[PDB]
Design a protein around this ligand. Structure first.
Ligand SMILES: Nc1ncnc2c1ncn2[C@@H]1O[C@H](COP(=O)(O)OP(=O)(O)O)[C@@H](O)[C@H]1O
Ligand SMILES: [Mg+2]
Lengths: 186, 21
């Protein structure tokens, strides 16, 4: 049974299988809703759009980001993100696949609680694990020690690890990343 | 005493996972 990796980042959801080099699905974490008078009848009008479909039709959609600064605020949009990334992007059954999920350090614990509860009840799995992104970045570097500066779209955090031992008193999180740079460029 | 004297690895694991992909 192949395990699943699903980095639910603030900007871009990146999901795929173990033992693979490139991520199978990389798509932005947006849920769109229509904001205009639907005048045409039929033709497959949806109540919501997830992912690249919301990116294509973005002229007539209010786009919502369910993750801000690493914290999942809206949860049914997050469930729609997970249902899309399980059943459309990857086209797999979550009932037969363990799932590793990523998380920023110094997160609220209730995010982990509700992530565990939804991921064990709505999309019920054999098993699950929540990791830290910088440790996986040090894994991809292939080395032992060092300080990892991981900077996504919401979270920029430094994690120092020496000889496979993290130092939790020296984790430095800052909520300044690419979305703030996008707002500043605006 | 005369009778006694007459008697006398992060690196290997991570590179393994890299080559597994
Ligand atoms: N070629 C690029 N040049 C500059 N910034 C980029 C480039 N590609 C991506 N980014 C920025 O990096 C941010 C984080 O990417 P990613 O780690 O995939 O975010 P997330 O995983 O949180 O969605 C994106 O919000 C984007 O603004
Ligand atoms: Mg990111």
């Amino acid at each position: 049974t192949t395990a699943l990796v699903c980095d639910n980042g603030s900007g871009l959801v990146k999901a795929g299988f173990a033992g693979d080099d490139a991520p199978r699905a990389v798509f932005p974490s947006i849920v769109g809703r229509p904001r205009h008078q639907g005048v045409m009848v039929g033709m497959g009008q949806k109540d919501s759009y997830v992912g690249d479909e919301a990116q294509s039709k973005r002229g007539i959609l209010t786009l919502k980001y369910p993750i801000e600064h690493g914290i999942i605020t809206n949860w049914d949009d997050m469930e729609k993100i997970w249902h899309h990334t399980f059943y459309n992007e990857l086209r797999v059954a979550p009932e037969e696949h363990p799932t590793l999920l990523t998380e920023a350090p110094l997160n609220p614990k209730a995010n982990r609680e509700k992530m565990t509860q939804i991921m064990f009840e709505t999309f019920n799995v054999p098993a699950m694990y929540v990791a830290i992104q910088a440790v996986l970045s040090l894994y991809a570097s292939g080395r032992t020690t060092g300080i990892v500066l991981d900077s996504g779209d919401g979270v920029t955090h430094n994690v120092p690890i020496y000889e496979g031992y993290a130092l939790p008193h020296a984790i430095m999180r800052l909520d300044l990343a690419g979305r703030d740079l996008t707002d500043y460029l605006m | 005493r005369k009778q006694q004297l007459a008697e006398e690895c992060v690196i290997d694991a991570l590179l393994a996972d890299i080559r597994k992909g």
